[PDB]
Amino acid sequence: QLLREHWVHILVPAGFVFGCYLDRKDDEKLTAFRNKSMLFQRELRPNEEVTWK
Amino acid sequence: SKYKPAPLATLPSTLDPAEYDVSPETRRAQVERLSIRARLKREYLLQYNDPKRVSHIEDPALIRWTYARSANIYPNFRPTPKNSLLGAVAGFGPLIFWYYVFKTDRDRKERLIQEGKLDRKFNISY
Amino acid sequence: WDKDVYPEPPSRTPAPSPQTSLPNPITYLTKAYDLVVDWPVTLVREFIERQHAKNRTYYYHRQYRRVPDITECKEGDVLCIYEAEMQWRRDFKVDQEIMNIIQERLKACQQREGENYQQNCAKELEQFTKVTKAYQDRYLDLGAYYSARKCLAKQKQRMLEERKAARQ
Amino acid sequence: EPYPDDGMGYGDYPMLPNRSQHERDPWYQWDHSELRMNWGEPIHWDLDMYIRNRVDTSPTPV
Amino acid sequence: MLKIILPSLMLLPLTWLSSPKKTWTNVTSYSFLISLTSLTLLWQTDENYKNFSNMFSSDPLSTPLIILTAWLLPLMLMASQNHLKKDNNVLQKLYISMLISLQILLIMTFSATELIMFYILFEATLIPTLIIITRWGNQTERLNAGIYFLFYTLIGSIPLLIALILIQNHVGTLNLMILSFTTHTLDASWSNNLLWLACMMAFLIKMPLYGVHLWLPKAHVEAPIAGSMILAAILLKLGSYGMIRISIILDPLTKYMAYPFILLSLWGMIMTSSICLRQTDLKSLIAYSSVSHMALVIASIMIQTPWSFMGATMLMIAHGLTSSLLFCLANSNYERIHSRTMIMARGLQMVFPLMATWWLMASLANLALPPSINLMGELFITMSLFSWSNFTIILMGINIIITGMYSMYMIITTQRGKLTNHMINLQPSHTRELTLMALHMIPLILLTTSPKLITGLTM
Amino acid sequence: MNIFTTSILLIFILLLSPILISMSNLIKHINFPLYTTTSIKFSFIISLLPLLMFFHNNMEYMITTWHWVTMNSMELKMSFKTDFFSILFTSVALFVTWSIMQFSSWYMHSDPNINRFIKYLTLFLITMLILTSANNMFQLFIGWEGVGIMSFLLIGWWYGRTDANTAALQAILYNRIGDIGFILAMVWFSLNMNSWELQQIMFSNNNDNLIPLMGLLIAATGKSAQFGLHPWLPSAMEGPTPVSALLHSSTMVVAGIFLLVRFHPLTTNNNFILTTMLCLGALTTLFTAICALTQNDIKKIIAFSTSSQLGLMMVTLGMNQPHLAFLHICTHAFFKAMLFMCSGSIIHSLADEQDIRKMGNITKIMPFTSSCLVIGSLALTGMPFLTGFYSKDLIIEAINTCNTNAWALLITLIATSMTAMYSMRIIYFVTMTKPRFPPLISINENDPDLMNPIKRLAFGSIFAGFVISYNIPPTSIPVLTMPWFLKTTALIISVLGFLIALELNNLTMKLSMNKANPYSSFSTLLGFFPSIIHRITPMKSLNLSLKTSLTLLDLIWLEKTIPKSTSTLHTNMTTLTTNQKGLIKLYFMSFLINIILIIILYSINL
Amino acid sequence: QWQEDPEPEDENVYAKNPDFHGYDSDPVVDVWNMRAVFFFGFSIVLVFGTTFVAYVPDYRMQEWARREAERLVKYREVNGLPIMESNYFDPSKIQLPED
Amino acid sequence: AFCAPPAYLTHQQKVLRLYKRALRHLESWCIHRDKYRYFACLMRARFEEHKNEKDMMRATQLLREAEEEFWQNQHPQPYIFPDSPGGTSFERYECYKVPEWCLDYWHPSEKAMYPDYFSKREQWKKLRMESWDREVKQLQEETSPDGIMTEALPPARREGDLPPLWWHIVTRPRERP
Ligand SMILES: CCCCCCCCCCCCO[C@@H]1O[C@H](CO)[C@@H](O[C@H]2O[C@H](CO)[C@@H](O)[C@H](O)[C@H]2O)[C@H](O)[C@H]1O
Numbered sequence A: 001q002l003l004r005e006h007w008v009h010i011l012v013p014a015g016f017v018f019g020c021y022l023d024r025k026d027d028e029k030l031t032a033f034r035n036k037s038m039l040f041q042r043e044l045r046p047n048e049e050v051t052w053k
Numbered sequence B: 001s002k003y004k005p006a007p008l009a010t011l012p013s014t015l016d017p018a019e020y021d022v023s024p025e026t027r028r029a030q031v032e033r034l035s036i037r038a039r040l041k042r043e044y045l046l047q048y049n050d051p052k053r054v055s056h057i058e059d060p061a062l063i064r065w066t067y068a069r070s071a072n073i074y075p076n077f078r079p080t081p082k083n084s085l086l087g088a089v090a091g092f093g094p095l096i097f098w099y100y101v102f103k104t105d106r107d108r109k110e111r112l113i114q115e116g117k118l119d120r121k122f123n124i125s126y
Numbered sequence C: 001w002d003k004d005v006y007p008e009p010p011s012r013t014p015a016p017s018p019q020t021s022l023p024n025p026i027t028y029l030t031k032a033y034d035l036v037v038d039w040p041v042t043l044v045r046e047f048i049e050r051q052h053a054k055n056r057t058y059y060y061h062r063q064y065r066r067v068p069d070i071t072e073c074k075e076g077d078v079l080c081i082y083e084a085e086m087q088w089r090r091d092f093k094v095d096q097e098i099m100n101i102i103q104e105r106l107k108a109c110q111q112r113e114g115e116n117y118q119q120n121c122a123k124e125l126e127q128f129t130k131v132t133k134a135y136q137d138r139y140l141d142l143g144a145y146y147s148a149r150k151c152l153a154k155q156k157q158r159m160l161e162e163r164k165a166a167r168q
Numbered sequence D: 001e002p003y004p005d006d007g008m009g010y011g012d013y014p015m016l017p018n019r020s021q022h023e024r025d026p027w028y029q030w031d032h033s034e035l036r037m038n039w040g041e042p043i044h045w046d047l048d049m050y051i052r053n054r055v056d057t058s059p060t061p062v
Numbered sequence E: 001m002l003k004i005i006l007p008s009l010m011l012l013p014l015t016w017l018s019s020p021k022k023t024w025t026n027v028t029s030y031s032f033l034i035s036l037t038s039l040t041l042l043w044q045t046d047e048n049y050k051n052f053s054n055m056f057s058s059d060p061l062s063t064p065l066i067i068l069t070a071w072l073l074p075l076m077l078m079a080s081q082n083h084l085k086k087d088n089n090v091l092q093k094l095y096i097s098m099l100i101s102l103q104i105l106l107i108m109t110f111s112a113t114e115l116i117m118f119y120i121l122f123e124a125t126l127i128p129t130l131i132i133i134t135r136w137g138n139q140t141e142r143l144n145a146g147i148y149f150l151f152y153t154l155i156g157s158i159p160l161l162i163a164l165i166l167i168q169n170h171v172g173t174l175n176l177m178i179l180s181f182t183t184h185t186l187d188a189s190w191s192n193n194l195l196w197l198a199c200m201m202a203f204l205i206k207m208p209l210y211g212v213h214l215w216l217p218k219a220h221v222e223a224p225i226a227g228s229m230i231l232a233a234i235l236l237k238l239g240s241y242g243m244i245r246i247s248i249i250l251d252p253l254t255k256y257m258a259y260p261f262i263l264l265s266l267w268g269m270i271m272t273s274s275i276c277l278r279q280t281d282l283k284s285l286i287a288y289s290s291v292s293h294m295a296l297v298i299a300s301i302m303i304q305t306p307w308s309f310m311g312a313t314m315l316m317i318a319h320g321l322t323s324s325l326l327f328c329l330a331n332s333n334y335e336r337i338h339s340r341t342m343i344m345a346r347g348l349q350m351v352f353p354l355m356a357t358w359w360l361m362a363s364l365a366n367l368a369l370p371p372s373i374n375l376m377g378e379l380f381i382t383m384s385l386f387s388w389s390n391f392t393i394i395l396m397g398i399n400i401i402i403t404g405m406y407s408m409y410m411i412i413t414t415q416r417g418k419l420t421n422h423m424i425n426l427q428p429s430h431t432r433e434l435t436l437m438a439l440h441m442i443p444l445i446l447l448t449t450s451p452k453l454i455t456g457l458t459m
Numbered sequence F: 001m002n003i004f005t006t007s008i009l010l011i012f013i014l015l016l017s018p019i020l021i022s023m024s025n026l027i028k029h030i031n032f033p034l035y036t037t038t039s040i041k042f043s044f045i046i047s048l049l050p051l052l053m054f055f056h057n058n059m060e061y062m063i064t065t066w067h068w069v070t071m072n073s074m075e076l077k078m079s080f081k082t083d084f085f086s087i088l089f090t091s092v093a094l095f096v097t098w099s100i101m102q103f104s105s106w107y108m109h110s111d112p113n114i115n116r117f118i119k120y121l122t123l124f125l126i127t128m129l130i131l132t133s134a135n136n137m138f139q140l141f142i143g144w145e146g147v148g149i150m151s152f153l154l155i156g157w158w159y160g161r162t163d164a165n166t167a168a169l170q171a172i173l174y175n176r177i178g179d180i181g182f183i184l185a186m187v188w189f190s191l192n193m194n195s196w197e198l199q200q201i202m203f204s205n206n207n208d209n210l211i212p213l214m215g216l217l218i219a220a221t222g223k224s225a226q227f228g229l230h231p232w233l234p235s236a237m238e239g240p241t242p243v244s245a246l247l248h249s250s251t252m253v254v255a256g257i258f259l260l261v262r263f264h265p266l267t268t269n270n271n272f273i274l275t276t277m278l279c280l281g282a283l284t285t286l287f288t289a290i291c292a293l294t295q296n297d298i299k300k301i302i303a304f305s306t307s308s309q310l311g312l313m314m315v316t317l318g319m320n321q322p323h324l325a326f327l328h329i330c331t332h333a334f335f336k337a338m339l340f341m342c343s344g345s346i347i348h349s350l351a352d353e354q355d356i357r358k359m360g361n362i363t364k365i366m367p368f369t370s371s372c373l374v375i376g377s378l379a380l381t382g383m384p385f386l387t388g389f390y391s392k393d394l395i396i397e398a399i400n401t402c403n404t405n406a407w408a409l410l411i412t413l414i415a416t417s418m419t420a421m422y423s424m425r426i427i428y429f430v431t432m433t434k435p436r437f438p439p440l441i442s443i444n445e446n447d448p449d450l451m452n453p454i455k456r457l458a459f460g461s462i463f464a465g466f467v468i469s470y471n472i473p474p475t476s477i478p479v480l481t482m483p484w485f486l487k488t489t490a491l492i493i494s495v496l497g498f499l500i501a502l503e504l505n506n507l508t509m510k511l512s513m514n515k516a517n518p519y520s521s522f523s524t525l526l527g528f529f530p531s532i533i534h535r536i537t538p539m540k541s542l543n544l545s546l547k548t549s550l551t552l553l554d555l556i557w558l559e560k561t562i563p564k565s566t567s568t569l570h571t572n573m574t575t576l577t578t579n580q581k582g583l584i585k586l587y588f589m590s591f592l593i594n595i596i597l598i599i600i601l602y603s604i605n606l
Numbered sequence G: 001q002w003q004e005d006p007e008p009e010d011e012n013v014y015a016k017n018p019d020f021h022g023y024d025s026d027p028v029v030d031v032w033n034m035r036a037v038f039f040f041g042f043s044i045v046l047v048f049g050t051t052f053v054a055y056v057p058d059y060r061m062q063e064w065a066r067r068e069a070e071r072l073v074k075y076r077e078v079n080g081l082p083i084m085e086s087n088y089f090d091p092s093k094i095q096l097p098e099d
Numbered sequence H: 001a002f003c004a005p006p007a008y009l010t011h012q013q014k015v016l017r018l019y020k021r022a023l024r025h026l027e028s029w030c031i032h033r034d035k036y037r038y039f040a041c042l043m044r045a046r047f048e049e050h051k052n053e054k055d056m057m058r059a060t061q062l063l064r065e066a067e068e069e070f071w072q073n074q075h076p077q078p079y080i081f082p083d084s085p086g087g088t089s090f091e092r093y094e095c096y097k098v099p100e101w102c103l104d105y106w107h108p109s110e111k112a113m114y115p116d117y118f119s120k121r122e123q124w125k126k127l128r129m130e131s132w133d134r135e136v137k138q139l140q141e142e143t144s145p146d147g148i149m150t151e152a153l154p155p156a157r158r159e160g161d162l163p164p165l166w167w168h169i170v171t172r173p174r175e176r177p
């Protein structure tokens, strides 16, 4: 097939997807204060487990 | 003559005493200058009309001028009392002058504001 | 458009009262305009609004609850200071827009009163002056790094000066 | 004729008369037409000041 | 921010794994896509600056510079496609790698949250720049130019490192947000004055300041086109950005420590705008215009007002675009006639009618034609300085007149007059070159349309 | 109002349409000059409607079209201020530009890039309208700067010339020297009133205003070419005759007068600024009226006439008569554009000859152009009941019946006489003589593109002053009670100037050699102001920029002081330290010295 | 003299391949590089980037601030309170140092 | 313009140049044709009075006095022909004077719009190529032994030879393109 010349067109998109994943992980690490700020301190609505995940 | 030349209104040529001297020395000098002009023009025209030429004509005189005005200024600079005095004055004197101007203005303004006498009316942006 | 925020006096147009035999070109030009230009545009706008009536959606003006001020929590508590600083920045951004609203009021009054602005824009000019003094006392002379702490320091210095003068 | 040896960086460069390009012969066929200079001719130190667009030093009736 | 950083890293393996024919196409296209992605930083719908993690952040001051850095790299790659036409494929890929590594480091620098990380990256950018200048310059003075560029920065940077270490020892952290929120006044002791100088000297040298600018004309004259582009566009703004960031903890000493540098910048802007009137090298003329323009940024940041900061940011962005456009325009003629002397080429509008239009637009932006963001920044800096002292208007007006004069002189000398007919090698303008100029100009027009994006922290 | 605002915006839309068409391929399929001329014509017709409404109800509008950006308590929004001045000037300028755009289709027919020429003229019209209809000082400045840039691009339309490039850059320089004052006014108003809109500025009536008013006065001096910054306008004749007719006479040069008129309410209460304006205008009037005499170039004479008239407008503003000054602007546009068009027709018909010493007998060889030229000349002079009259007569009456500088008044009257003097110079040397032009004759007025626009401008120069003076609302209270001599001074001095110039011109045919006169040379060589300033100022400035900043400081001393000094110091230390002989004897002697030093250190430190 | 190569001569790029776009000597690679530049630079980044930036909503609370300002102006004028008061912080909250 | 100046002008040349300038400035002073003719006849009478002067020192003295008088009485603003240096429309048409070599870069699509013109142009270029070697040889052999050279160029001496350095003199842009 013609893969040996076009496979190289997955690096940068893969980098972007991996960066989005790493950003989500960094979001997870800072979960503290999720619903505990003086502002934005509403009670969870029914069937709601996290304010902004 | 009633026309007195100035550095920015140079003496004409028809009023120039040196244009009416027919001495063989000056005549030889003028002929030599024309010979130099002719040789340079011949070389330039040969290059200009060369049908195999594929680029512009480099100008040694222009290269020399740019080199002299840029890269050769420092190698041929020697500090002297006049050089040092001029350098210090030009470099700093304007700075000291404008420092005093700005500082006196700012100090007077600040004294006015401290005393409350400055009429800051619709000043809102600063 | 809310008239209470943006007061626009009632118009006082005089009656035509023509006193000549010639026809007024502007009346016929306005008739031709109201026919050719004003009517198809009105129909297109009505169609657009009819389409908007369907697929109608609502958006809300966000409300922020007051949080503890800068004065209300301790030196070096970055959490408190961040909350109070964001609140102060919000209030400062809103003060700027109130300033803008009153400046628009003043400019519209000047244009409207026209030649009587020296006498019939007294209310707007006085409002501008008073609100301008308030703005200056609040925010003027704070650095490009203005912050709730600098505003508090400025207010406390002004209060100390006022108190000293009152004592004397 | 070189510049005076006052150590101002001129070095070996010649000193040509301080005459604007306006004064060169306008009917001649100069190699550098608007500079009114020939190819290879030594260039004045202040040529860019004396070009026909800038400082003019031509004689005057008064 | 990692969603911008990581694809930039992946550009490098793409460069080294792409076939020799498709390398330029692939790298340029994906750089353009990364530049598009970087626009996600403009989605700020509140006053709460973006904080992605403990290590990266974005504010109204950082986002414009990050987007400009992301945008420039495709332009540099395009500009470098001709003078690297003869080099080996390994060498071309090495050059692409240097440019990509510069982009990554600059984006990391502008997104940094800690002053020490800022320092590490802001000094890491030197290696790619030195390599680009020295390994791909055309004249024998590129080595000395690189030495100047390196050591002017290093000498000023070491005191910056000492000051940062001292601040971290005293406070316990270097996080910019913590420093801003827990900032306290500085006693006016001699040690604190020396701390102020150590904090500001590196950035002032990078700006550059009037007395220590000799490294910039050399670097621009000896650098390749991409080197000049990135330098003028971003590496000068590193100093202004650092000054804006670090001045938040140096108050109130600024009020009296800014006089020497305010005066130096105000006078040196005139003294360099004047040099632009009688500079023979076109690249040197552009470099000195940049020095004079950056004097304004220095002065405005020093006086520190809501207007000064916004004007400084707007002028930073506008100069970043305009100086790069001017350098590309000059390099277009250089690649044809192989001389930087301005007098050598004349009447070029008779053979490049559209390049002359680009020249005119670039020059008008340079002299600040309203409503251009150039003039927005310059006007607001002028107003802030006028409020500072009412006699600054004299110097500002002199500089304005000189700027108009030299800007129009460039055009009249190069694009107008009688064509230098002896130049048979003036080939028609490349589509690549015209696209480069268009990509430099269109963002300027759009930012003029929407200037709210390039205001700074203050407004 | 919908109709009024729609007309105001549609004028700009129509003007912008040709600019957009020039960026598409349709410009090759259409006749671009004719399309642009039609666009200007329709813009004029549309603009005639707001003019009628203002004449009827005398209402003025503030129209905010677009919110550009808000800058912390200062909103910059595109705003148009449509009042008496803007409404009247828009119509006058559109009429003049319609005529000149039609004329250029003929004058520049041979010249390639006529499409670019038409686009440049349209751009200048757009920018001038932006300037004249703008609430914000910032939008006014956009127009102010774009007008100068289009002036640069048009002066030296033939960029092959070097004189043309010098004239264009001269215009740019002399206009930036006034843009400094404009920016001074902008910054002062921004700081002290926190706004650039005239509505909010108006509440600065009771302040000092000396600084902002002086800034505006410097800007007006620069832009309208008052005595201080005047050389550029006479030198702006390098460009095409249509450029001269439109920009540097009919519309561009009146920008400073328009700015002062716009800010008139503030300068009403500042006696210093009014006195300065009066004196400056009187000086400019006298100086340029003198310079116009003894000028052997039709375009140069007309340019100096324009400068003199602008000086008169500045005198009118020095007196508190802003409405009268604007009325003179509007009236003068007509006949000045007509005069320039007629001169262009003469120059085109002759083999591009501008010197009047090679013309003559045009009254017979070109009846139509000669008649239009004489109409324009009499209009320029105070011929009763022509477009010039309803402004010049009232200006002279107000000058006489006011508290004014005696010298300003006297030299203003002398200049009013010199106006007729140089008009008679043109008439005599270009009409009332024997033919001095080359022997082969190829003169053809018969072309509609030439004839029609001049006919329109002639109807203007005859009736527009009357129509406007009657339609405009009452503005100020004139003084109509004065001695017979004060009332008739305008006519008397104009006729005296005509007769004196006629006698002097008749005396030229006498076979007596004309000897050079000191005053004749002062007039001819423009008072030596160019010859001296344009040589001393640039020479000193450029010599400083090279010998001081670049050579002395940047290339020499700033190298010696920092990099070279540091490098030399460390190159000296390295050679001092690394010249070791390589002898263990000396190395161990040094080690012994080190040991002794350490022992001493410990001993004295305890 | 050392054994050095001579200076290469000036080339006309359009001499061969008069459809040269400045990108590459190979015509196909050149045209495709030009197409990629024009597509990803103008069609993608500039158009879509401009649209996205334009439709960023309420950029930095510019609109919310104006709506709040209108609300507060109406409320304060209806209730008779000052539009803006010279003390941002209620002076009761502040404990001024004695003397 | 076509001829190159000599190393120097002779007395006759200087006197003739002075005569031409004096008559032109006299025409500028006397606007009218009849007056100009009268005064020009008088001026020629003055010139002729000293047409015979074998004291080549009293000739130079007369010339210098005349030049002083000319600089004293010259028109401050003389009359310049529109196309001459200093006259309006001097270099007016230098924008449209595109040199011939610009046609080398025309796209084949653009040359297809003038099939015959470029057919003849190829013949002209072939002629230039054939001639160049012979013309450079002619100049090289014509070079004078003594260094006293001039800008004057030789004509074609043999047959089928073009004059040396002819390509730029020919093919120069037309005065009114
Ligand atoms: C304010 C603090 C920040 C400013 C700090 C300044 C430190 C800068 C030091 C950079 C050192 C530059 O070191 C530079 O070395 C080069 C070698 O290429 C020397 O190069 C030069 O040397 C001498 C002239 O002196 C010549 O004979 C030689 O041909 C020339 O190349 C420079 O003379 C020297 O200046």
Ligand SMILES: CCCCCCCCCCCCO[C@@H]1O[C@H](CO)[C@@H](O[C@H]2O[C@H](CO)[C@@H](O)[C@H](O)[C@H]2O)[C@H](O)[C@H]1O
Pocket (backbone or CB within 6 Å): E151, E155, F566, F567, F568, F570, F571
């Ligand atoms: C403030 C502390 C900072 C210290 C560090 C800053 C960096 C300083 C670098 C010092 C070294 C510079 O090294 C520099 O080398 C160049 C050549 O390369 C020398 O250049 C030399 O050129 C030739 C010989 O080659 C000699 O004729 C000339 O006199 C000499 O200058 C410089 O004289 C030397 O100064």
